[PDB]
Amino acid sequence: SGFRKMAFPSGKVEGCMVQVTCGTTTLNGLWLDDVVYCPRHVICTSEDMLNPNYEDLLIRKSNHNFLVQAGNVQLRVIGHSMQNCVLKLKVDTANPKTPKYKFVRIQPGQTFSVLACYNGSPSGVYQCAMRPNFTIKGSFLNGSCGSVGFNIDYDCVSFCYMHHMELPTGVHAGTDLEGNFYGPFVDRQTAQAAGTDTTITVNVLAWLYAAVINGDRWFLNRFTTTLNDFNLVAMKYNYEPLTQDHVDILGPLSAQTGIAVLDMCASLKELLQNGMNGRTILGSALLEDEFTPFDVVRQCSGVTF
Amino acid sequence: SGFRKMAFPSGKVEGCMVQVTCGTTTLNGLWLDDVVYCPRHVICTSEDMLNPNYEDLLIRKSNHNFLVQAGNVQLRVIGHSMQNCVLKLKVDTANPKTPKYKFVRIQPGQTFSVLACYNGSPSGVYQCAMRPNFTIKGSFLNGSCGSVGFNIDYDCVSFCYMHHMELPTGVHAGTDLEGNFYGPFVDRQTAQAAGTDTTITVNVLAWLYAAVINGDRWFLNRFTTTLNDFNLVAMKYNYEPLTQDHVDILGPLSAQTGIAVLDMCASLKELLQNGMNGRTILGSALLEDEFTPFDVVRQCSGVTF
Numbered sequence A, B: 001s002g003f004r005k006m007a008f009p010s011g012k013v014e015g016c017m018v019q020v021t022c023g024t025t026t027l028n029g030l031w032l033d034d035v036v037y038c039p040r041h042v043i044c045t046s047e048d049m050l051n052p053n054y055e056d057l058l059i060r061k062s063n064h065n066f067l068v069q070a071g072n073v074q075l076r077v078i079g080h081s082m083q084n085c086v087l088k089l090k091v092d093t094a095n096p097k098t099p100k101y102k103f104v105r106i107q108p109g110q111t112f113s114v115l116a117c118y119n120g121s122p123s124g125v126y127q128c129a130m131r132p133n134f135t136i137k138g139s140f141l142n143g144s145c146g147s148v149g150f151n152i153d154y155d156c157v158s159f160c161y162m163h164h165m166e167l168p169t170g171v172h173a174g175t176d177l178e179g180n181f182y183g184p185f186v187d188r189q190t191a192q193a194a195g196t197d198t199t200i201t202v203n204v205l206a207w208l209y210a211a212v213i214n215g216d217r218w219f220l221n222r223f224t225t226t227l228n229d230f231n232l233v234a235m236k237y238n239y240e241p242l243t244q245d246h247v248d249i250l251g252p253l254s255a256q257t258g259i260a261v262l263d264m265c266a267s268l269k270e271l272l273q274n275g276m277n278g279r280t281i282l283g284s285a286l287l288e289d290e291f292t293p294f295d296v297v298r299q300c301s302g303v304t305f
């Protein structure tokens, strides 16, 4: 019983983190087989952070300008390239601790674990979600660039995020591991604003199902509703619209609790119109939207890796 | 910027988890050097879960009845003992992946990371606190016994908790690694109730300091107060009383924000008397008490391991 913001075990990623230095900037790289991956802005200097031409800045750099350390060790760069917004440094030694892995580009509403690193050393692990506006509400300090986000499927690590920057609003932006940013953000010191951040409806429903499984029943009601009529209420409160694919993704939880999806939508509707009245659900006093339906089943059914 | 429930990287503990079977019960053990540690109730059977005599049950068991697996491997038990409520199984192979470690018995209000395991395989990692009534509000399913809680200090793992059981109220109880329970709980299927669960005041203050560091300023007020007068308000709302040691532990955060401890107490007092008025602090709609002063500085100053 119980329900917590649970991250994946980080062991397999810990072994992959290295420190990357170009001139005087030091950030984190990801060492997989014989390639090190890091944000390309490692090659920036102070004055061209406003509008750097990375291609131009790269002509003035050779293999030996990039210093890669894995712990106290030193690795030899024998090649370098730029793929969108990440650098790929080819090194002489394949990581002995490379796990089975793949690169995935996740969708908004999806969640992942973040291993926050500084100087190539892991500091902590937490869960977060890709928000509908393609930011993440992370916990990152100066130096955290190149930290990565991942999901684990048994023995296989799926890398989905590499941290690049903080926006002046305090939320965070980054790329997939092919270096394409999530959202419309660029790796420059310009005015970049996030759009409207709406609530991930299918995740809130999943979280109500978890509450039910754990015995928290007070919000369930007599009412039912329709997809169209719920989405009317969703739009006034800035909730993502619910589709039949979302209804289908909720099937497993519906089956376990005996509660149909549309009856749970009816319960959410009342909580949006009348609030929670100083009550709490699963220890929280607001509707939580960073647990996916899969996050819920894994926590309340015990999937291992 | 940002603030999340952050756990320690779990790599060093992952390598220590093994599967322990006695007859037909399978739970998790902790393999450190040539000893495996697990809850002694692994030797229970169905009918004597009401009141087992562990000493008696142990006379009918020899080394070869205990099966220990580390992954697909099998380890040889060459000795066994009972220390309070844990079994120590002596095996023929020292764990090659033993980290530097120590056993610590933590105090209420202190926090740690939990690696939830099933069948000796890690499932997820999260943070929790030892509550003032010596329970923990964890996330554990059947099979999770023997999962451990730990803090990390650079390279050294401090083990503080081993999970033993769930109470019928849904919270969790366990031992230190010397097998002495936290609280008055016993490893039997009897009516065991937790006492009053009060709020950890020094942790709430620490969390207000984190909010300030992250720019969340709206709760700060003109008032100040006194230790005695704050504790009057604390007792009506079931908050732990604040001592001068607690004031001193908050010194670093006070120094960083320029805000004296007693002025922050004045702000907490108003939030207890008038509530938060539908506002939120650090994304939460209630006062969070599972971050210690050290948790805060580590997150908002970047300690690595």
Ligand SMILES: *C[C@@](C)(O)C(=O)N(c1ccc(C(C)(C)C)cc1)[C@@H](C(=O)NC1CCCCC1)c1cccnc1
Residues within 6 Å of the ligand: A026, A027, A041, A044, A049, A140, A141, A142, A143, A144, A145, A164, A165, A166, A167, A168, A187, A188, A189, A190, B001
């Ligand atoms: C990458 C690193 C380690 O230097 C860093 O911490 N940060 C960063 C990221 C990108 C850049 C440029 C502008 C693309 C070169 C510089 C610095 C900071 C960060 O993003 N600061 C931003 C704040 C205002 C807008 C411009 C830069 C960082 C700080 C906290 C969390 N993540 C990243």
Ligand SMILES: *C[C@@](C)(O)C(=O)N(c1ccc(C(C)(C)C)cc1)[C@@H](C(=O)NC1CCCCC1)c1cccnc1
Residues within 6 Å of the ligand: A001, B026, B027, B041, B044, B049, B140, B141, B142, B143, B144, B145, B164, B165, B166, B167, B168, B187, B188, B189, B190
């Ligand atoms: C240990 C294990 C893996 O069998 C288990 O999951 N649980 C458990 C713990 C202790 C016991 C005895 C009674 C001491 C032998 C039995 C089973 C359960 C658990 O604690 N169930 C309790 C619920 C009602 C009171 C008696 C037992 C468990 C379940 C969920 C989370 N943690 C532990």
